């Protein structure tokens, strides 16, 4: 799902919810939010973008290869 891919990319990351929030510039309640999935298009597209480092494109679709599952 989205939430797993910014949440499971946050793990690999070595980062929380918290950290996220504060390097996106935002509050950890937003981000949860957003991990539950109660909104539409976030504000901070960019900032969840660059605060994983991933592409945009890839939040919003966000497919990266598939090796099982």
């Given at each position: 799902?989205?939430?797993?891919?910014?949440?499971s990319?946050?793990?690999?990351?070595?980062?929380?919810?918290?950290?996220?929030?504060?390097?996106?510039?935002?509050?950890?309640?937003?981000?949860?939010?957003?991990?539950?999935?109660?909104?539409?298009?976030?504000?901070?597209?960019?900032?969840?973008?660059?605060?994983?480092?991933?592409?945009?494109?890839?939040?919003?679709?966000?497919?990266?290869?598939?090796?099982?599952?």
């Open positions: 799902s989205i939430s797993s891919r910014v949440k990319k946050r793990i690999q990351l070595g980062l929380n919810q918290a950290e996220l929030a504060q390097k996106v510039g935002t509050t950890q309640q937003s981000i949860e939010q957003l991990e539950n999935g109660k909104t539409k298009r976030p504000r901070f597209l960019p900032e969840l973008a660059s605060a994983l480092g991933v592409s945009v494109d890839w939040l919003l679709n966000g497919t990266s290869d598939s090796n099982v599952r």
